[PDB]
Design a protein around this ligand. Structure first.
Ligand SMILES: CNC(=O)C[C@H]1COc2cc(F)c(CC(C)C)cc2N1C(=O)c1ccc2c(c1)NC(=O)CO2
Ligand SMILES: [Cl-]
Lengths: 233, 12
């Protein structure tokens, strides 16, 4: 459970700095989770780093949707126990739009009554959702791992008695939800890349973990060396 | 030479 330490005047700059500090602390937890994941643990170090650098925002967004769903029935974005709000608190158009988009994903968790077991496998699929344009160092090992997790989700959904009569439709709704994460996450990253580059002028602070990740991720994304993987596109 | 925080956490 990572706390935000939400202080200072309520400005967009100060809120973003608080969220970035929080995102850096959450990222320490994400790396520890990824490190012991079956299959991933076996990938070469450069590939493990590549995958986390492309999908960090997707992993944080999906975890935010889960917290929001579990703690507020997706009425608010539950960033931390001390930082809970939705788009209604946003005065700037872009920030309102990004919160509203995140709110809509969390509402899909309510629509589906997403289970913790589904969430756990789907989170792994997001870690494996973007690769380099020319693939990874161990592209075959990665492809086997990704296929195995897709099959794990499919089997869990279709075999569950809670889904009888509509399990294949549910599996396709879950994979459509994973595809919809690409659109939202691209928008969040565009905002993040902007505040990162304009950090001094905007007064938006970033912790060392994020400075290092964004510095490696941004040239990849800018050069078109980012291949998103879709289930339905 | 100096390792990133991500590399440190993945290798510790
Ligand atoms: C601690 N993070 C989390 O719990 C969730 C993560 C991921 O999903 C989010 C969804 C969301 F609607 C908002 C609200 C913003 C858009 C007002 C933030 C985040 N998250 C971010 O970290 C984040 C995103 C874009 C940014 C930044 C930070 N920093 C920037 O400087 C601007 O771009
Ligand atoms: Cl720091």
């Amino acid at each position: 459970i990572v706390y935000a330490g939400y202080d200072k005047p309520d400005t967009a700059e100060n809120l973003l700095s608080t969220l970035n500090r929080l995102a850096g602390k959450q990222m320490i937890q994400v790396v520890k989770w990824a490190k012991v994941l079956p299959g991933f643990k076996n990938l070469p170090l450069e590939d493990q780093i590549t995958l986390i650098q492309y999908s960090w925002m997707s992993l944080l967004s999906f975890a935010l949707s889960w917290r929001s769903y579990k703690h507020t029935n997706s009425q608010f974005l539950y960033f931390a126990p001390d930082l809970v709000f939705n788009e209604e608190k946003m005065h700037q158009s872009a920030m309102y739009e990004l919160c509203q988009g995140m709110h809509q994903i969390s509402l899909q968790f309510v629509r589906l009554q997403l289970t913790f077991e589904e969430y756990t496998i789907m989170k792994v699929l997001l870690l494996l959702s973007t690769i380099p344009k020319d693939g990874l160092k161990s592209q075959a090992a990665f492809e086997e791992m990704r296929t195995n997790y897709i099959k794990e989700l499919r089997k869990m959904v279709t075999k569950s008695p809670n889904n009888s009569g509509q399990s294949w439709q549910r599996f396709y709704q879950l994979t459509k939800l994973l595809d919809s994460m690409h659109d939202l996450v691209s928008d969040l990253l565009e905002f993040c890349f902007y505040t990162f580059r304009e950090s001094h002028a905007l007064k938006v602070e970033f912790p060392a973990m994020l400075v290092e990740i964004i510095s490696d991720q941004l040239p990849k994304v800018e050069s078109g060396n980012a291949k998103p993987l879709y289930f339905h596109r | 030479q100096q390792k990133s925080l991500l590399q440190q956490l993945l290798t510790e």
